[PDB]
Design a protein around this ligand. Structure first.
Ligand SMILES: *[C@@H](O)[C@H](C[C@@H]1CCNC1=O)NC(=O)[C@H](CC(C)C)NC(=O)OC[C@@H]1C[C@@H]2CCC[C@@H](C2)C1
Ligand SMILES: *[C@@H](O)[C@H](C[C@@H]1CCNC1=O)NC(=O)[C@H](CC(C)C)NC(=O)OC[C@H]1C[C@@H]2CCC[C@@H](C2)C1
Lengths: 298, 296
């Protein structure tokens, strides 16, 4: 199952940011609030905004930042790519240890879905190879963030900005750089065709082996290049060197070399399951990373 | 599959140790709640006479830790399968809360913890056979399940054990088990499980709301004729209150409840023929009608 990180350290950072009647969520860390820059847009400006021009018209006193009903005074503002940074006069006492990270496709993270600065729910998301996520976002959710927690430290990796015609979602890292080819404009935009996250399918096969479900292990191996060329014909992602390395721990735990598992997967792609199941499913799961597999099995 | 934000519960988790047994406790005001089997040794667990084992314990045999800080136990009592440890310190992070006993088919969020530290949060349902399909490992006992309404946390589950099939069992916060289970180290089977029909229907309505409707059809059915088929396939019967509960989703989608029942009947008799619904190859039954509504 999809297991999220405990959300409390992030709940303690959520605020709301309002310009006129446009309200979205912001992230309050130390004395800075981060939020999507389109908070400065009127509904009519979103159709195609000139962000630099809209911002020059704004002053600190135009931004309403609230933690609950308590206003936080803004003392400076700047735009960094597609995010606004609002300097406020109070350092957030609940600021966790944190960092800003830019994740790769296939990586998973927890989303704390928020409305009006109030958290509604937490769930696990995977960044697709086409740089969309299958979120559960409604109007007012922008500025909700995605994150991982490692020991004491919250790694923020996603801030929510928009929905695409197909129902999937797009956003930025906390430096305001979109994942994928998207722009924060209320225009119709299409994601590239999606593909299957090979490194996560391999993680899932390793998980199956750990649990004693290993009928699919074959006697063969392959080169990485040969595997990548075959996998693309089945709309699977090619593997990177980094993928091979993050499978290291599971390969060590099972004694199954990464390239042997690749050969087992190739046979499943070429011959199908033949009516068999793996971990109680005829479908190969691609939204559990190698870290997720280790998280849940211990 | 969306869980409630877990912060209000994280601020209540502590570590409870007795002997070489460690698990989690729930610290509310000046009381820590935890599974009573913490007082057992390996031998005691086979057939523990808990009242006899507990009378032999002193307050100082319980080590309670909230982070780096030890909380001194100044008294203890047992309520069914839960131990209540009175401590000298009040938890300033205690939320507004209540203890509820949930009904089968209801959902809740689980904050899985180890050594008093939160590790993950996820949504579970109380199965009709009163197990839960959780993800709990060694040391997870005392992890709790909850729902949040406005500011109020309703605690409904505390974790005690894993069955041979890999599913999980536990108590309400009064210490009464869900199901016919006992906190002893013996292999226990559950009753035959069934599928939560009202939840399957809610999930089908969710699939429609999200623009998927390949499973719809032009048939209909009476409630009783649907229930005959449901019971044949070990689905729970659908009551008239269930139908009422599903009204909002039926209105939203323009699909009468009994029409969706006819769709589910077709799926039960014909399978899915390799298709998927909301990504799943199986009919999902751990989303309630309220869950679907809150998220759509
Ligand atoms: C919490 O103390 C613990 C949580 C269990 C451990 C594994 N998964 C869980 O949910 N509860 C127990 O250990 C419980 C104590 C009795 C009620 C006195 N017994 C129990 O759950 O037995 C089953 C586990 C399953 C697993 C594989 C074999 C050896 C261990 C670990 C027994
Ligand atoms: C937060 O402000 C919202 C969150 C959105 C709304 C509902 N679900 C979501 O994920 N963000 C937006 O409304 C953005 C603002 C602009 C990027 C500045 N726009 C948006 O998401 O529009 C959706 C869009 C989808 C199709 C393509 C373009 C026209 C319509 C059809 C609407």
């Amino acid at each position: 199952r999809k297991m999220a990180f405990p959300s409390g350290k992030v709940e303690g950072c959520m605020v709301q940011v309002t310009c006129g009647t446009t309200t979205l969520n912001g992230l309050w860390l130390d004395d800075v609030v981060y939020c999507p820059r389109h908070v400065i847009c009127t509904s009519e400006d979103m159709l195609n905004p000139n962000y630099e021009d809209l911002l020059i018209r704004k002053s600190n006193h135009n931004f309403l930042v609230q933690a609950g009903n308590v206003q936080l005074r803004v003392i400076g503002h700047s735009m960094q790519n597609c995010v606004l940074k609002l300097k406020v006069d109070t350092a957030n006492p609940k600021t966790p240890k944190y960092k800003f990270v830019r994740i790769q496709p296939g990586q998973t993270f927890s989303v704390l879905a928020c409305y009006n600065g109030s958290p509604s729910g937490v769930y696990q998301c995977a960044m697709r190879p086409n740089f969309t996520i299958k979120g559960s976002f409604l109007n007012g959710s922008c500025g909700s963030v995605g994150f991982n927690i490692d020991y004491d430290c919250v790694s923020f990796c996603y801030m929510h900005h928009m929905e695409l015609p197909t129902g999937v979602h797009a956003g930025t890292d906390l430096e305001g750089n979109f994942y994928g080819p998207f722009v924060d404009r209320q225009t119709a935009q299409a994601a590239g065709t999606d593909t299957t996250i090979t490194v996560n399918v391999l993680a899932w096969l390793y998980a199956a082996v750990i649990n004693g479900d290993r009928w699919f292990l074959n006697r063969f191996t392959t080169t990485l290049n040969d595997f990548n060329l075959v996998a693309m014909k089945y709309n699977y992602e090619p593997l990177t060197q980094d993928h091979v390395d993050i499978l290291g721990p599971l390969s060590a735990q099972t004694g199954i070399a990464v390239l042997d598992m690749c050969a087992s997967l190739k046979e499943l792609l070429q011959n199908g399951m033949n009516g068999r199941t793996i971990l109680g499913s005829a479908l190969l799961e691609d939204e559990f990373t190698p870290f997720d597999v280790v998280r849940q099995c211990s």
